[model samples]
Target: HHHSSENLYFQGHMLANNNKRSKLSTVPSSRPIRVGFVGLTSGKSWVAKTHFLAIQQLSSQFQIVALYNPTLKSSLQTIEQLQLKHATGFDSLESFAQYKDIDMIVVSVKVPEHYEVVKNILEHSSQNLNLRYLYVEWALAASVQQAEELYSISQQRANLQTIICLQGRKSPYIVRAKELISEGCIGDINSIEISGNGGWYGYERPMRSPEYLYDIESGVNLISNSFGHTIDVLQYITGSYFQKINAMISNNIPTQFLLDGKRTKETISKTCPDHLLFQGILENGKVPVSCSFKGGTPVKKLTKNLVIDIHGTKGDLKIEGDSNLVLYFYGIKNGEEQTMEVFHLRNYNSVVGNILRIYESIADYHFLKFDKQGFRFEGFPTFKDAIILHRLIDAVFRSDKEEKTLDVSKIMI
Candidate 1:
């Protein structure tokens, strides 16, 4: 049976409520999150379409007031095409930083160029009127060393905020799951098993983007790009990070791809890990977490999926999804076969709803000052959290190379 759109309608209403919660009250009584965007495309781009629209939807919380591109031509073209005459287009980073009323810098640059751009911002923030508040896309840097450096530099200034786009699992669904888990929906959690198709690593269609073909620094690869979010979601639900790990990574496909255009492709290769397997413990080494993923995927159900199993003494919770994004939760209800809950975190037909949850959390962070025991704003993944993920990635590579299990704690980013 095709349950393709089942419970999706409920998500529409829930996302409406999410938008309601996203409404800014006295929070904007300070100033809307004036946003300056980098890596804008003159044509089709994920950044322009989603990042731009997401922040733009919440008119009270954020304003897309500026654009930064690599060249004057691209910037001007994007402005004219999108009809954003009010937003200034920048030809240089310095000019963009010096732009008026700039509160946050949103970087959607390519993977390999992340460090250069982010590092430039951090090192010269004081030079550019002490520019603070950065919202960077995930895979914050090319290497753990670079991530470490970025995280360190970001912490150098007080009250300087940072936001990283690791928004895959940190949504209304995941937040609600955290509540149920803490409320003892499943008592005394013991284990978590998560496995899925990382989608891009499997040997199927040709490598679509040259950036992902042979480059290891391109954080858009199997581990950091796909599987990393999976792990982060599991950890968020379980309220723990990986304490130890034993892992094996494989480059199942070493083929190469030829590009047709900007992002069109044929086939390709690299030393990147296409398949990954690992078992580790969370909850300060008290619970076990096991995960396996094969990259590159088929066009249909044999691939492009994610399943999460949380086992405990009282009951069990199972979450499954496609492309590891459209998640559904299931459990036995009233001694019947089963009942399922649709994951509504990022359920918006567009990325607007999901991204608003992220910005909402950030707004609360600034206004609510959420530093309680079970802080409400933990969903926002900052540069520090990005490095922790980088640390785990470094551990996976080292473990596979040494052919042994390594404690994740021992790995330093």
Candidate 2:
């Protein structure tokens, strides 16, 4: 379904509309929605760590019926790891598309491969009449142009529902903050400031994440992943989109360190920004926003690593956390200020819990019918929402390049 730019303008140009309760689009499935996962590797993959673990919780809602990997060997290994003994494996997109039971195809592969993987699956797949969902991770594609292209193509599929993993909005901290903002607890936000750590050190060290992340072409860097998630949450809470933006995105540590634990010879000059700083004004309420994310861990001793302060006329709302899952809120209540830690799903780690909330939302979307009481969609961001973010990121890049504040309403230069 297409969300008009005018609708987006009021909805914050990003869909975290839990504040406004409404009915979700009805897409009914009788049994569990069978999933065909792309890039479900065993180790060193985000999909392996988070997505696999989250799906395990919702076995009645989603079942892993198929795996799409580059090789049958890897697929077999993943199936064993996830304990999906009955799940079939496919080494090619054409074959994977032909599988008759897959109701959802999750593209959790590398950022550079997202475009081709999604395009191929959509083009070649026609088996399940209920094969209507396509879920992709953040930084939807390698570039804004690519993401826009994918969005156009995906929109053509009339029954298809596209989901983007901008899961930060689903975090308990942001959700509660939005509710407080809607309740006038903050009394019309005047400005917002966010300071956080990206969790990657700027100095040379052994490679922690995938090697492709260091390369600018991969589109999974600090700017795309860290800043992308952070800003999305910011907009989601404030219900505002940037109208004008000024940014200085930089790469303080340029030399790439090897994963071999020895920086003997091989090195790739890292172009991805390790430090990001930006200031912008929101279109809806004219609220100013300033944000900064450094690459290293927090300098503070035993404090929440991510801090967001929302200043207002009546009271200020503040959120601090080591990660989105373990967040704490400090705001006014009953004419008094109090600080409290927010809780999410119990007995799950940070990343998995955040993703589990998303999967739960998807399950609810598929099965839940609207009643007279009405229900909130719970802020599941779609490709249309990602486009706005991609454009904003593009604007940041352009602003940094041209060294000027950009009119973000103008999607391009």
Candidate 3:
């Protein structure tokens, strides 16, 4: 509803104020970053709607100058849907990559297809040093082979300055909880637990769209698509990488019809897990934790049941199922019983607020503390930290696969 744009404007002002007052030098401004989105069928597509929406809201910092899809028809439809005028749509990746003006490329295609698209983009951009950034959306959802391929391309590209994995839903509510935990509001967090109901019932039901979402390879299943957000949040709040993961995954929804309503006698082979339960220990030596994800439950009731709870030495924090409100129960003091304190962390209404809060929290942690060793002409304050988080997810998966406790320190590179 255009709410994000309004927030971005105010955030820019606030950031300017904070930089001016602090001894830290003002962050340098680069030329408006030109972005090219690669994906077919933009309307209602999660990548287009969320990523492009945020980009549009921050148009002063970035310009989406081009879009590439496999077909002109889908490209035209997307351009019209986004109401983008300057965006040039191309029928092939070669034609789009050849454009002299494009700066950054956003690969929003299916997870399995990202390796090839990103590799091709890197090779094309080798001719132009200005094309330095590639943002791969939801990369962990891809197969292990796909993830490896993307990593190889990243290592090969010398000019590639930043590779952002768009693990969305790092919402303000989640951010605030992290802040409270770090501030000792929860006191030494001992344990954290989370439960997420299965796939999006509204999208998976036969009566609704009759889509074959139950197929593990659809790249839209619960474990692959939704679990990353939960895992990312856990690491974000804990401020530590998981050392080991013991996981058991199940497939409850065995058969489904295709989107075109075709009835196939053969059952689709499920390659990915639909239901996953994971227990792991973070590097901090905190209490062990568990994460659960399941698919195909009762629609309305199931939607409201997703929840997360954190137990600490001094208090406990609980996020009500599917709500932004965070309820805190403080430990007893001086022989007094614990009491509850409620904080309504609601930044969901404004995109600017959400982004600003995220930046502020990172600033407080000195996460990107500026230094000569880390400074680069094209580097942003958030780029390196984002890459660390991406690698953390990779290590977690590797531990799960090997059935061994992999030291996170070994995977830092």
Q: TM-score: which candidate is best?
A: 2
User: Residue 149 in candidate 1 has what lDDT?
Assistant: 88
Root-mean-square deviation of candidate 3: 6.6
**Descending-lDDT candidate ranking:** 2, 1, 3
Candidate 3, residue 353: how far the Cα is off, in Å: 8.7
Off by over 4 Å in 3: 1-9, 13-31, 166-169, 200-213, 217-220, 256-272, 299-304, 323-340, 345-409
TM-score of 2: 0.83
Model 3 scores worst on lDDT over the 10 consecutive residues at 367-376
Per-residue lDDT over 290-331 for candidate 1, one digit per residue giving the tens place of the 0 to 100 score: 888877555346643677778875567766666244445454
Q: Which ranges in model 1 have alpha carbons more than 4 Å from their true place?
A: 1-29, 128-130, 206-208, 217-219, 256-267, 299-304, 323-347, 367-379, 410-413
User: Model 2 over residues 1-413: C-alpha lDDT tens digits?
Assistant: 35766674332222233332322222232466789888787645778788887887676667888887778998887778768866998978888887878888898877898888888888787555667788888879988888999988877777778888887777767677778777677577888888877665454446556667777767777777788888877887877777899999877688755545445455556666778898999887888899888875334466666888888866777787664444344455533554443545455465787788888777767654111110133637788888878999888889999999999865522
Q: How well does each candidate superpose onto the true structure, as a TM-score?
A: 0.82, 0.83, 0.73
Q: How does model 1 score by TM-score?
A: 0.82
Global local distance difference test of model 1: 0.67
Error of 2 at 403 (Å): 1.3
Better of 2 and 3 by lDDT: 2
